[PDB]
Design a protein around this ligand. Structure first.
Ligand SMILES: Cc1cc2nc3c(=O)[nH]c(=O)nc-3n(C[C@H](O)[C@H](O)[C@H](O)COP(=O)(O)OP(=O)(O)OC[C@H]3O[C@@H](n4cnc5c(N)ncnc54)[C@H](O)[C@@H]3O)c2cc1C
Ligand SMILES: Cc1cc2nc3c(=O)[nH]c(=O)nc-3n(C[C@H](O)[C@H](O)[C@H](O)COP(=O)(O)O)c2cc1C
Ligand code: SF4
Ligand code: SF4
Ligand code: SF4
Ligand code: SF4
Ligand code: SF4
Ligand code: SF4
Ligand code: SF4
Ligand code: SF4
Ligand code: FES
Ligand code: FES
Ligand SMILES: [Zn+2]
Ligand SMILES: [Zn+2]
Lengths: 150, 953, 589
């Protein structure tokens, strides 16, 4: 079935976080049934599993959209105008950061750093980096993304 | 190891944490440290000053030459800031707003809960911790508590005054409650003034031990309750009963003894240790306008004193009363009842009328005419009053926010034809009498220090209307109680220190914790009460319940006589009205560590203001409430439930400011399986986790722990029973117990509060006459159940030996051979029992190996024989091991059986049964023997109405 | 003859368009029927000049900058076939004299740089262990296997190597504490959980040269006695994880990892633990709890990780940069390492020049170089010639150093004195267009997000400090807010349990210390840098306006010759697309 991956991992409590990462790879999020089978296999309380899963910002309990927009709010991007580009993205898309659109097209996320601090205003859309972003340019990129291009 | 704490030399254990030793020698705050867990650094309140810097003492290990300052300025500031940070995210009320509205700060919630239970004597006992005349207050108080009530935000405030009147009259009728007087302190206090303030000072100084003498000018005690308050509001038989309850405590009354005429203040100081001046304001203020000397200008207090004393009062047909206080209203209604057409003139509006509003509405019904914003300017007549000149007034400028002052409207002068003018514009004490005795007063009101209530003379205190001017009975009783507190502090030498502590307790914390009196006074007079800003939107979920209406006497009939206009409520409406309380106060207010620390460190709630985390209360569980709004995030519940109980009921959720405690997302506490859910109520330090109590209203009471054992099984776990005047509130966990924790069976099933009332014969309850007949007729072999203490077993065994009756017990086998050390040290165990039926085995066997071969200790369920390895034989009766030790095993053979205790497996027995009750476990005293062979003591929570010893004779 | 063509394929290169350039090079080599070796390299450090294409002759390397796909045919035709370098695009030259590589660059970026950790990055193929062997690698591993483990510890403690991930605890002492601890099973951890928002040096080492970290870990494990090694890298760094897995496979199959490593009887295995992502999990105790499957909540220090760490067994947790320094110390000697840097801080430090600096990238500077040299000779100053107001050193944990204190040498104590810390190695340059209150608010916002919420001081005081900063920024502040900040920040520093909260008030403290005039100007309702949204008003200059209306079709809120102040979203796109001096950001007063 879908939950076969759990038994490849060692039934020690230390395997929880790798198992959570494997679950979020397999399903895109953390389902309840998978979490209870993880708690059963590792013999850890389900409250411990939920505390670990809610501690880390990687894990979410609802599936992600098609286009994931990652706004870098590191120091280099912030001093070069990350607030203005996030304002442009939020105003064009219509959701705040950390939310999914109702149709599930655009998921908006905030990330720490992407390594390209020289392209200081930088976002990432599905592992593709767009850099040197004035608010107008990122509005153009969002509008071109919405119409099925890119 | 030698460490230096605040300059002194100390020897401490090396392995143990420093916080334990420091809390042994001094006071160290801290939420999150429990010795069963490793040190946790979450509360950050146990800070000490080391040579390296400021660090937490729960993590430090005692080292050689370590010097630690526990109370320095920086440490006080750091703890204060930490407490203010915690309070900035705290949501809840320590006390209900009813207690803050009462000038005497009475536990309104507690005695309303006691009234809802039907315990009126206990409710009056709780009332008398803050005031002394609950019937008088139920009749005449302006009900400041009902103004502040949180029921004002939903429908209608609780009838606190009328419920208090009902309970107080029940106590006066069905036997009055009198307090306990401690041994004499050897001190004498002179009290001047037989009014409510003097009575309160005398009562609360008598309840401390000092011998009190009351001096009063009038022939009777009561003051303006007897000579100023009319008898249609306060009947004098009720006043006599209430004052009798105050005076029967041992107060020496000297009536018809005045100050300045019979005894001077200097003689009073030389003969008595402290003197309280509550002479009251018995002079009436003149108006100063010309013509005030005309015949027909009576003063309100003199007129009401003549009417109350029965003296001949001459009154005309038209009477004008000037003033707007309670004095004016009583003058107006008394003059209406004597036969006069009464008009009351007040210089302000109706809203700013100081009078009791219920009395004003009653007077408007009875036909008293009011004209507000009017002021008399002149009284016109040859020798007697014929007419009075009045000027219309308007509100003036707001000035320095002084609620404006009435300024006359020029040209609006009008004349009213009247026969008598009664002056009720205010009261004061005689200024010349105050100069005769030497007390510093301004405008006739005595100047006293606001904290200590002390005059310019040493040993002289003041209160009542002498200090507050025209005031209330409850405010006078508050001043009297505070003066009793301050007189007791003055007689020990601690008054100056206490005043400094009450001004700023954060600078004298060492003296506060070192002195019992300073701690008590600080927590009585300046406690930290946490508040929430609630509007009407926060009580929309509450059921709308109507307030009780008491049928007043007919206005047309009551305008002619001096019969009491308001009766007492009927007893059927009392419970219905008392059950409307929303119990706004915190259930943990008497044991919450956060409130105590905020009291000691002078923490303000508004020091840091921002956004708080808003949570919904999780009260779906039948017995336990979880309130994350009162969670200080110490982690003790998580540490217990994951590292000691292994149940994992709750855990930390989310990160940072959004962190809270709860089950897995999508489930509440009702879905969580665990027999140690109720231990979290004792684990929590502040009151985020609380227990639902099996009473109608759970209102927090000052319960006293009682050390006893549980009767759920052979473990006989040590516990505290929380008792409040014969009420078995809850079972809690002792720290000094061999088990430390108790299960949800003991807490929530309460086997210690269970007893069958009457003997059962063949499945039907019978009276004791039938039991005596059965005992006399049949052979009645004696079968003992394991619910009896060791002394009872000895008594029953000796009775059987003396009389020859065959004796046995339902329990058979041999006792356990293992000790708690053996179970603690062994690692491979044989478990032939169900783990769920003996819940402490879950805690005792954590991490052990459950094997079937090569074991070290064995756990078997009785009846059984000891095995080769040290065995743990577990029965279902607490004193099963005591029965096995005394040698009363087996069921002997006979015709009919009398069994002492309703134990199961008695249906296996052959014949006919007489089940005699064994009694309440909580009402029992003696020792028991539990599974591990310990002899554990049982103590009485309350007096026993049944004993098995006298039943058998 | 052109031996090889190399394209920089780090995360910074990949983001700039290095995949497109690499594929264009492959297409051009295939089209021209050329037989040159196409290899990938890491990052040399010129992140501002990327994508970088290196043409490797046997004796010289010619590195071209800004190599887009369309520039590739020109470069290929003119250089690899005709043989004429295009000197306009040549940004870097490397030549060998007496076995030491010498560097020339257009910008003088490398002049003040001594590369100890990044000596191989941008020259070797990170996915080919043969290239790293040919560059002198893993010779230090054989040399360390020759000597005794305690001799290795003495070598490390005599070089003055201090921890590059934090406070700078001496590494030899840490190794000795892990070796002297009682126990038969011990672990080592490589901390690659760089949670600093502005730090990219650790992933730079793990992507451009992972075998350096692997070799350092093996040397340290031999010295300490560890059986298992953990590389704690985030799952947000997939390229680093991929290259680490490739490198681990190649080192295992060649006998450097496994059982009986090079005949020493020493069994060592390295396993990559993927961190889920939290700034607090970079803390030692939180990292231990995260590997063990718990929440990343730190615990008090008197039980130290070097004596009771992973599952109770002793653990040595060191940074990627420290492990990368170890092979250089073993190969070149401890005296060579002690011949660099100040008296107390030895060696070299890797900094990340970011923000408003012109030559941003990864710099390898010796300890004791002055801050002004890094900011002006290596960084080139600001990108528009403006003055530098301050630098943020240490990320959110460190503080702002102003321009009159730029003479401070970058050693541990000289930076600790000013109220900053060396921290991760992040250097963010702030200019005249930067509001220091906004910077402090950003750092406190990050701290509020990343706190684990265990101790009362961090969890509550960071939120209260951030609320005070937001109050001051919105203009609704007063002097009492500044006094509350000045009282609260030292207490949050003194009372917090872990280093996140103990370094949390550092930005606020430093900004108050050096830039209190900006705070007092925000009390009066004005932003001297025109950054805060409510304190700035976008005003239109009518006398300097034009009828072309360039800043009229780009505005999405429709607040434009006249500005609708009641409807302005305050994005600021007017000031850039106007291509004329008409829009002026002015105080709303
Ligand atoms: C007309 C009237 C109506 C009121 N109605 C209400 C009401 O409806 N509700 C309400 O809550 N309160 C009412 N009050 C207030 C009520 O009287 C309060 O209890 C009052 O504040 C009592 O103050 P006290 O403690 O000073 O006692 P007092 O009543 O002032 O007692 C004074 C006592 O001191 C004695 N004394 C006086 N001078 C000397 C002296 N020189 N030496 C020795 N003894 C002396 C007097 O004989 C008397 O026993 C009313 C008061 C008045 C006057
Ligand atoms: C909040 C916080 C984040 C940290 N992040 C890192 C990190 O990303 N990388 C790192 O090497 N050390 C980090 N540290 C420091 C570690 O706790 C520890 O000191 C470090 O691993 C020691 O490295 P060293 O052996 O080279 O001295 C962090 C510390 C704190 C308090
Ligand atoms: S938890 Fe403590 S401090 Fe908070 S409201 Fe309840 S009693 Fe007061
Ligand atoms: S004395 Fe008055 S204010 Fe106080 S509780 Fe009783 S009725 Fe309420
Ligand atoms: S509802 Fe009860 S507890 Fe709350 S204010 Fe009213 S009387 Fe007090
Ligand atoms: S619920 Fe109580 S015990 Fe648990 S963390 Fe909160 S305050 Fe502490
Ligand atoms: S384990 Fe048995 S004796 Fe102990 S508390 Fe529970 S029911 Fe009572
Ligand atoms: S300082 Fe912050 S991150 Fe560190 S333990 Fe305390 S609350 Fe957690
Ligand atoms: S602001 Fe500039 S672009 Fe806009 S209308 Fe004026 S001149 Fe034209
Ligand atoms: S600043 Fe932005 S929102 Fe305001 S007018 Fe210009 S483009 Fe429009
Ligand atoms: S700060 Fe955003 S890419 Fe580095
Ligand atoms: S920090 Fe020591 S008791 Fe909480
Ligand atoms: Zn780069
Ligand atoms: Zn600003």
């Amino acid at each position: 079935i879908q939950l076969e991956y759990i038994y490849h991992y060692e039934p020690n409590p230390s395997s929880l976080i790798p198992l959570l990462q494997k679950t979020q790879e397999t399903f895109g999020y953390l389902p309840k049934e998978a979490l209870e089978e993880i708690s059963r296999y590792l013999k850890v309380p389900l409250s411990r599993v939920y505390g670990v899963a809610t501690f880390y910002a990687q894990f979410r309990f609802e599936p992600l959209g098609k286009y994931v927009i990652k706004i870098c709010h590191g120091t280099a991007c912030h001093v070069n105008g990350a607030v203005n580009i996030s304002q442009a993205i939020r105003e064009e898309v219509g959701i705040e950061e950390g939310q999914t659109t109702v149709d599930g097209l655009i998921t908006l996320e905030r990330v720490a750093c992407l390594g390209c601090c020289s392209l200081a205003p930088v976002i990432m859309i599905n592992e593709k980096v767009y850099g040197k972003l004035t608010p107008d340019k990122v509005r153009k990129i969002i509008r071109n993304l919405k119409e099925g291009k890119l | 190891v030698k460490i230096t704490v605040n300059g002194k030399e100390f020897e401490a254990p090396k392995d143990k944490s420093l916080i334990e030793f420091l809390r042994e020698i001094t006071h160290v705050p801290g939420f999150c440290y429990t010795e069963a867990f490793d040190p946790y650094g979450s509360c950050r309140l146990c800070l000490v000053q080391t040579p390296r810097g400021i660090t937490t003492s729960c993590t430090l290990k005692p080292m050689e030459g370590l010097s630690i300052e526990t109370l320095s300025d920086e440490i006080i500031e750091m703890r204060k800031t930490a407490l203010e940070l915690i309070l900035s995210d705290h949501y809840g009320d320590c006390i209900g707003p009813c207690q803050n509205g009462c000038p005497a700060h009475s536990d309104v919630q507690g005695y309303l809960a006691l009234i809802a239970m039907g315990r009126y004597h206990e409710a009056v006992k709780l009332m008398k911790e803050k005031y002394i005349l609950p019937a008088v207050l139920g009749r005449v108080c302006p009900a400041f508590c009902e103004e502040e009530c949180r029921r004002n935000l939903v429908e209608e405030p609780l009838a606190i005054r009328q419920l208090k009147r009902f309970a107080a009259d029940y106590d006066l009728e069905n036997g009055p409650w009198m307090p306990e007087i401690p041994p004499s302190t050897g001190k004498r206090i002179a009290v001047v003034g037989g009014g409510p303030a003097g009575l309160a000072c005398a009562y609360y100084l008598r309840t401390m031990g000092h011998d009190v003498t009351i001096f009063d000018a009038m022939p009777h005690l009561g003051g303006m309750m007897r000579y100023g308050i009319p008898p249609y509001r306060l009947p004098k038989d009720v006043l006599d009963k209430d004052i009798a309850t105050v005076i029967n405590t041992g107060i020496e009354v000297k009536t018809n003894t005045a100050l300045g005429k019979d005894i001077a203040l200097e003689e009073l100081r030389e003969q008595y240790d402290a003197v309280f001046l509550g002479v009251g304001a018995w002079k009436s203020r003149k108006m100063g306008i010309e013509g005030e000397d005309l015949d027909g200008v009576i003063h309100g207090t003199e007129f009401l004193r003549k009417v109350n004393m029965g003296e001949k009062v001459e009154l005309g047909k038209r009477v004008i009363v000037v003033g707007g206080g309670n004095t004016a209203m009583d003058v107006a209604r008394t003059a209406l009842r004597l036969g006069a057409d009464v008009t009351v003139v007040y210089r302000r509006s109706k809203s700013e009328m100081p009078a009791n509003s219920r009395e004003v509405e009653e007077a408007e019904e009875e036909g008293v005419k009011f004209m507000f914003l009017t002021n008399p300017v002149k009284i016109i007549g040859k020798e007697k009053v014929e007419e009075v000149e009045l000027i219309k007034m308007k509100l003036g400028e707001p000035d320095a926010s002084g609620r404006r002052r009435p300024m006359p409207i020029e040209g609006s002068e009008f004349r009213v034809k009247v026969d008598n003018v009664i002056l009720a514009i205010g009261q004061y004490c005689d200024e010349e009498f105050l100069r005769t005795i030497g007390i510093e007063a301004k405008r006739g009101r005595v100047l006293v220090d606001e904290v200590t209530l002390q005059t310019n003379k040493e040993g002289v205190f003041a209160g009542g209307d002498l200090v507050l001017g025209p005031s209330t009975v409850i405010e006078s009783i508050a001043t009297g109680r505070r003066a009793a507190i301050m007189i007791d502090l003055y007689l020990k030498g601690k008054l100056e220190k206490a005043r400094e502590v009450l001004l700023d307790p954060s600078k004298h914390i060492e003296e506060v914790i070192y002195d019992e009196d300073l701690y008590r006074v600080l927590f009585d007079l300046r406690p930290y009460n946490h508040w929430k800003k609630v509007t009407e939107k926060d009580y929309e979920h509450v059921e709308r319940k109507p307030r009780v209406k008491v049928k007043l006497l007919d206005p047309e009939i009551r305008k002619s006589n001096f019969k009491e206009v308001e009766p007492t409520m009927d007893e059927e409406t009392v419970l219905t009205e008392a059950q409307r309380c929303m119990s706004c106060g915190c259930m943990e207010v008497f044991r919450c560590k956060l409130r105590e620390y905020a009291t000691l460190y002078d923490a303000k709630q508004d020091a840091f203001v921002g956004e708080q985390n808003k949570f919904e209360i999780d009260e779906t569980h039948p017995n336990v409430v979880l309130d994350n709004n009162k969670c200080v995030l110490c982690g003790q519940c998580v540490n217990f439930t994951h590292e000691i109980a292994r149940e994992g009921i709750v855990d930390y959720l989310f990160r940072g400011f959004k962190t809270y405690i709860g089950p897995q997302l999508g489930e509440r506490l009702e879905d969580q399986k665990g027999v140690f859910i109720g231990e979290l109520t004792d684990i929590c330090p502040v009151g985020a986790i609380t227990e639902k109590l099996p009473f109608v209203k759970p209102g927090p009471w000052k319960t006293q722990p009682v050390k006893t054992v549980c009767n759920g099984c052979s473990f006989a776990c040590e516990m505290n029973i929380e008792v409040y005047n014969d009420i078995l509130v809850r079972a809690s966990s002792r720290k000094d117990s061999w088990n430390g924790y108790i299960c949800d069976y003991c807490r929530f099933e309460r086997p210690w509060a269970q007893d069958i009332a009457q003997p059962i014969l063949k499945g039907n309850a019978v009276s004791w006459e039938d039991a005596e007949k059965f005992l006399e007729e049949k052979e009645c072999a004696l079968i003992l159940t394991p619910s009896l203490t060791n002394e009872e077993i000895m008594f029953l065994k000796e009775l059987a030996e003396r009389k020859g009756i065959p004796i046995g017990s339902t329990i058979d086998g041999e006792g356990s051979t293992a000790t708690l050390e053996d179970i603690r040290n062994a690692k491979r165990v044989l478990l032939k029992v169900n783990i769920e039926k003996y819940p402490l085995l879950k805690l005792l066997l954590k991490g052990k190996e459950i094997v079937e071969e090569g074991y070290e200790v064995a756990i078997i369920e009785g009846p059984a024989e000891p095995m080769d390895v040290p065995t743990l034989i577990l029965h279902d009766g607490v004193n099963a091991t005591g029965l096995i030790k005394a040698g009363v095993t087996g069921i002997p053979e006979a015709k009919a059986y009398v069994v002492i205790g309703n134990s199961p497996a008695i249906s296996k027995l052959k014949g006919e049964y007489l089940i005699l009750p064994s009694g309440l476990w909580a009402e029992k005293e003696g020792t028991v023997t539990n599974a591990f062979g310990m002899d554990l003591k049982v103590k009485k929570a309350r007096k026993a109405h049944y004993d098995v010893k006298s039943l058998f004779n | 003859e052109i031996k090889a063509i190399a394209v920089g394929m780090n995360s910074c290169g990949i983001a700039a368009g290095a995949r497109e350039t690499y594929e264009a090079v492959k297409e051009e080599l295939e089209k021209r029927n050329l037989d040159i070796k196409l290899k990938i390299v890491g990052c040399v450090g010129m992140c501002y000049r990327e994508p970088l294409l290196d043409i490797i002759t046997d004796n010289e390397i010619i590195t071209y900058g800004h190599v887009t796909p369309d520039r590739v045919p020109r470069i290929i035709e003119e250089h690899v076939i005709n043989g004429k370098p295009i000197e306009d695009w040549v940004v870097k030259k490397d030549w060998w004299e007496n076995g030491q590589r010498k560097t020339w660059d257009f910008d003088g970026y490398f002049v003040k740089q001594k590369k100890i950790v990044l000596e191989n990055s941008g020259y070797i193929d990170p996915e080919n262990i043969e290239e790293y062997i040919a560059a002198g690698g893993y010779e230090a591993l054989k040399k360390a296997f020759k000597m005794k483990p305690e001799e290795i510890i003495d070598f490390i403690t005599k070089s003055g190597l201090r921890g590059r991930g934090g406070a700078g605890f001496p590494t030899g002492l840490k190794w000795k504490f892990t070796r002297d601890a009682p126990g038969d099973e011990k672990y080592i951890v490589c901390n690659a959980d760089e949670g600093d928002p502005g730090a990219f040096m650790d992933r730079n080492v793990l992507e451009g040269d992972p075998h350096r970290v692997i070799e350092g870990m093996i040397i340290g494990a031999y010295a300490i006695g560890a059986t298992k090694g953990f590389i704690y890298v985030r799952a947000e760094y997939p390229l680093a994880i991929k290259r680490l897995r490739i490198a681990l496979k190649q080192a295992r199959e060649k006998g450097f990892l496994g059982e009986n490593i090079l005949g020493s009887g020493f069994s060592f295995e390295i396993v990559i633990k993927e961190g889920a992502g939290a700034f607090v999990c970079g803390e030692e105790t939180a990292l231990i709890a995260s590997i063990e499957g718990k929440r990343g909540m730190p615990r008090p220090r008197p039980p130290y990780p070097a004596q009771k760490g992973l599952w109770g067994r002793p653990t040595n947790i060191n940074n990627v940069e420290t492990w990368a320094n170890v092979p250089w110390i073993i190969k070149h000697g401890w005296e060579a390492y002690a011949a660099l840097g100040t008296e107390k801080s030895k060696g070299t430090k890797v900094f990340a020049l970011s923000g408003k600096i012109k030559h941003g990238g990864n710099v390898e500077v010796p300890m004791g170089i002055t801050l002004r040299e890094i900011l002006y000779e290596i960084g080139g100053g600001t990108k528009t010639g403006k003055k530098i107001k301050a630098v943020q050193l240490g990320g959110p944990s460190g503080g702002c150093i102003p321009d009159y204190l730029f003479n401070t040498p970058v050693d541990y104590e000289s930076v600790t004195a000013t109220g900053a810390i060396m921290g991760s190695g992040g250097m963010v340059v702030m200019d005249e267009d930067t509001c220091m209150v906004d910077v402090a608010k950003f750092f406190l916002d990050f701290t509020v997000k990343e706190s684990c919420g265990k101790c009362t001081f961090c969890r509550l005081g960071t939120k209260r400090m951030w609320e005070l900063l937001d109050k001051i920024t919105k203009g609704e502040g007063a002097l009492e807010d500044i006094e509350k900040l000045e009282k609260l920040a030292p207490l949050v520093k003194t009372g917090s349990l872990c280093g996140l909260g103990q370094t949390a008030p550092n930005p606020v403290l430093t900004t108050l210390k050096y830039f209190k005039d900006e705070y007092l100007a925000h009390i009066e309702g004005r932003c001297p840098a025109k950054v805060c949204k409510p304190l700035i008003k976008y005003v239109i200059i009518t006398e300097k306006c034009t009828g072309c209306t360039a800043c009229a079709i780009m505005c999405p809120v429709k607040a434009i010759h006249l500005i609708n102040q009641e409807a302005c979203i305050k994005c600021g796109t007017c000031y850039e697309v106007c291509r004329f001096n008409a829009i002026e950001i002015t105080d709303a007063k």
